[PDB]
Design a protein around this ligand. Structure first.
Ligand SMILES: N[C@H](C(=O)O)[C@H](OCc1ccccc1[N+](=O)[O-])C(=O)O
Ligand SMILES: N[C@H](C(=O)O)[C@H](OCc1ccccc1[N+](=O)[O-])C(=O)O
Ligand SMILES: N[C@H](C(=O)O)[C@H](OCc1ccccc1[N+](=O)[O-])C(=O)O
Lengths: 423, 425, 423
């Protein structure tokens, strides 16, 4: 008797009601009950999404790479990579701007020196690039490594397309049967995503309630100033960067938002970019009208290697730590911050738990060495106090940038269905 | 070579009885090492051949069955089979307590204990176990052999395929039908391989029962022998009283059910593995009981996972044994708490690895028998574990039998039972 | 632009140029640079090959077992097993012969007694044989265990063949759909192998360059005698054993060599038999002309349990250590060496980390006990100093013996396409 409501209003009601409920319940100390009784529902939602993340990626990408030309796929890849890099750089730049504007960490008033530390910690870039190529596709599937799955699925789709054009008949029949199996699997995955979207309001409610109950009291003082700065920066990235990029390519951005809102809310409430990937892919297919050969490749790669929100988060937090210990970053230092942030988003591709690694590398690039007990470690733990509050918004902005790049590359290659954008 | 020329049913029965007598004779004379070195490998090969098929057959059969059935009908089937499982488990602990008090298990152990109720062993939170039913990676759940997430994913996939095959578009319907045909072929090949392995099954049953009797045959004396007798009488009671009455009230002739299930029964008994017998149990369900895939392809793996009436009866006997051993006999209310906590542990230990010791520890803790090292209750528990395999054979047999009985009952209720298989002449 | 050249001439140029380049660069001490800048390309090539091993083996073997009779498959298995054992015995024989000819270890002049014994237990044959039978096919696929995959694929193919001959019609359609899926997967895998063969020159160059740069300086004194002995023994095994076996069965050996050249070079540069397995399978089908039901089963089993090169290597190294410590092996001890070497190649079938277990087993079989600090341990580390130079040839000869056995069994079963052998 609950499914009778519109799903969009249901997800919005879930979000707002969970926010207010978690805030009031954490302000009254019953947050444990929220962790005991309310959070399991959001946990169930996130588990249902993670269940679908891998098969949908495999099947959708093999089908899309099959139903497209290799030169087209390479052109799409170069376009989407240039887009991702430009958006990440603009995100770090906006983050530094809003950090210097809010003067984040100015009132922390901590004392620190130049006590250095050596680190050979950055993961080898060559080894990660090699690790893009799996040594066992079944293992990469079981271990949930998305980039090896992308590589294997693209190669398999290209092979299937080359196989269906043979003078022999057995070869064409077998290749077409395989492609039909993969297509049925992908369609079933999208249907199951649509089905799970009915439980999404309860999951959003529970997740936002737990997050607000736990870390709602901690957003005071300089941490509150940082929260305001990061949210202003994310809003700035969205509006300025994404809307300008969309209108330049002649697409209505407000409709883009009305379509992406589902993936936006899901990414925001789950704080997992790759975990929302099924919802983002469904939004690409059955609302925006993007061709499979575009998004089935750009969206997983975007969720993996394109994080504008985290880029802006690092850009603001480095200035916060700098002003906290009393060593504000110079202009050249901020330029180095932007450069090392993009280089860390690229060099930590698929490396597990890279957010702390990326932030440590960004701090190292300017000299802020994360030695235990040091004041910089104190400021970093201060930030990790509100890390989840920031993670919601940064994940939302990451998935939004991914979707914007996908639709832009589709509009360029004329693979975008305009019927869904004219009402 | 010319060994398949005999009926495979008589062959597995002969294997069982000859291996039982052979293991008893070889273990009573101390030659158990030779049996462990030369004879057991064949039973190991049999159990490995059976384990090989468990995952693909379950996945494919359940995807096909959930596809070829209605979602509301499947949910009704789930509710029916779950209430059946719980009622049978409760009756099983009740029978176990009855036969334990009748045999007076543990009376002559004569151990000393006080009221020193020490607390240990934080139980894993139930909510996380319930959530773990939903997989986070189907490929990973397949590789790890986790049965319940595979069940969930397969049900969802079958429902999706059925709803996909009824679309106004035509290409999508063809693709969905191709996928369903792939799963159907995989399942049929798996059942054919189960039938093939059933020809080697006599050697496996012989070797397994021989090894078990050789190892733990000398240890079934005194109070441990009384426990063996009590638990086997209780398992026989559960079979006869509970299962036959449940079948006859629902209008099924129980002797036919037993004569058909005997293959899976013998396999479960000799292998002591429920999920390892699951392929044989499903083939018996299809080609003997006449159950539709949409019923058993869902109820039989879930039953092998979360329905163990034999283990409930085993706990009902062993808790009374330990209580009488340490000299603190269980009251009637304590025995009711035993039954309730045993059913609740069969529910709360769904798919958690190594959950049998967890369940027994929980039932012992629920009455105060706390397993502190060196304590008398731990001593009595190790005394029981001395004959663990001897008891495991029968309890596994009864688990698989209860699973099959529930599946057949729920199938007959949903009209998915083929009555042609039940008419003589 | 660069693919416009014949790929065979390209891989040969890569091999020889990389050999000379690594030799020149290691004689000047800059070999570290080769490990930093050159080796990643060979690593990429080897990972691209590792990616394909599981899908190609699974699909090819299920298809071949389907498209063949079970009795024929068993006869082929018996033939190929007898071939493998005979070739391994001949390999240890040639190793002992060339070792006695080169007098390996004579000038080491080490001192040893009859002291303390070590016992690397041989894996019990029963447990390994049982582990051939998987308990979970998905797990064996993810873990890359080849023999359980072989067993499961053979059983599945036989089941599909028995299913296609049933009175029911839906069952035949489903079985044919499944077999078509597997066939398409196998054909796509072979197409991808052909594609990777275009990058193969760079990988071959990089691998041989790294191996020569690292272990090029190490070929001095008795180690040079060991290198010469093992290479002469492998050359003899090829010419004497394999050519005679091929000509006896009415096959032209020079044609076999000219066809196997691709898998030979790949195995040589990658030193991995199972990693070269896709190239060997493609060469077997589309050059040698063997039916799927033959090679799709014999070639993986050969890569797993047939290693003539390693057998000859052990035959040489045992004599080397014996002459090093000053206790030359008697004739009966050398016979025990060959017997235990064949029995260890059989008893370490699919057991992880073999060859070290096998060599320890042979040394225990003659009494040379590998206790740490002992002179035998010193000589063994002396040998392991140049392990890769020998490993190249050992892997090449292993895959060559596998291919020769496959072609011989095909000629016997008349499953060999003679058109591919007509000039
Ligand atoms: N989890 C957030 C997100 O949804 O992007 C965000 O990125 C984490 C991150 C970074 C690099 C590679 C992969 C991931 N990852 O997906 O955990 C963060 O924690 O700040
Ligand atoms: N071993 C018997 C069987 O399952 O066949 C039976 O159950 C043990 C049990 C319990 C829970 C999860 C898994 C298992 N398991 O498979 O060992 C028993 O010993 O009473
Ligand atoms: N690597 C060589 C080869 O390609 O055969 C050769 O065998 C190693 C070996 C042995 C047993 C199982 C697997 C492997 N393996 O593939 O590393 C060697 O190192 O001497």
């Amino acid at each position: 008797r609950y499914l009778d409501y519109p799903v969009l209003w249901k997800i919005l009601w879930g979000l707002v009601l969970g926010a207010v409920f978690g805030l009031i319940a954490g302000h009254f100390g019953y947050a444990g009950a929220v962790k005991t009784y309310i959070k399991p529902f959001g946990d169930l939602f996130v588990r249902l999404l993670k269940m679908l993340v891998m098969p949908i990626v495999l099947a959708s990408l093999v089908v899309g790479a099959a139903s497209i030309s290799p030169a087209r796929l390479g052109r799409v890849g170069v376009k989407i990579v240039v887009y991702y890099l430009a958006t990440s750089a603009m995100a770090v730049f906006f983050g530094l701007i809003v950090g210097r504007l809010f003067n984040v960490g100015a009132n922390v008033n901590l004392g620190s020196g130049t006590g250095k530390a050596i680190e050979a910690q950055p993961p080898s870039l060559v080894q990660t690039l090699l690790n893009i190529v799996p040594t066992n596709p079944f293992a990469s599937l079981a271990k949930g490594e998305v980039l090896p799955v992308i590589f294997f699925a693209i190669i398999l789709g290209i092979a299937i397309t080359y196989l269906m054009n043979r003078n022999e008949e057995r070869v064409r029949k077998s290749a077409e049967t395989l492609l039909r199996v993969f297509d049925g699997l992908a369609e079933a995955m999208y249907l199951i995503v649509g089905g799970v979207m009915q439980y999404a309001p309860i999951g959003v409610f529970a997740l936002i309630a737990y997050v607000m109950a736990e870390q709602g009291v901690r957003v005071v003082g300089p941490l509150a100033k940082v929260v305001g700065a990061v949210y202003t920066g994310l809003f700035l990235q969205i509006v300025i960067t994404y809307f300008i990029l969309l209108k330049v390519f002649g697409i209505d951005p407000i409709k883009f938002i009305r379509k992406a809102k589902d993936a936006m809310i899901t990414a925001f409430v789950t704080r997992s970019s790759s975990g929302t990937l099924p919802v983002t892919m469904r939004v690409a297919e059955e609302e925006m009208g993007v061709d499979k050969g575009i998004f089935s490749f750009t969206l997983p790669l975007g969720a993996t290697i394109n994080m504008d929100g985290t880029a802006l988060y690092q850009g603001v937090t480095v200035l916060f730590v700098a002003n906290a210990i009393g060593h504000p970053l110079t202009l050249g230092q901020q330029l180095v911050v932007v450069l090392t942030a993009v280089l860390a988003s690229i060099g930590t591709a698929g490396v597990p738990g890279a957010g702390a690694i990326m932030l440590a590398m960004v701090l190292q690039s300017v000299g802020l060495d994360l030695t235990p007990g040091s004041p910089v470690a104190l400021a970093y733990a201060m930030i990790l106090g509100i890390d989840a509050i920031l993670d919601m918004g940064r994940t939302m902005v990451n998935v939004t940038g991914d979707l914007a790049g996908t639709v832009i590359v589709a509009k360029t290659e004329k693979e975008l269905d305009e019927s869904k954008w004219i009402s």
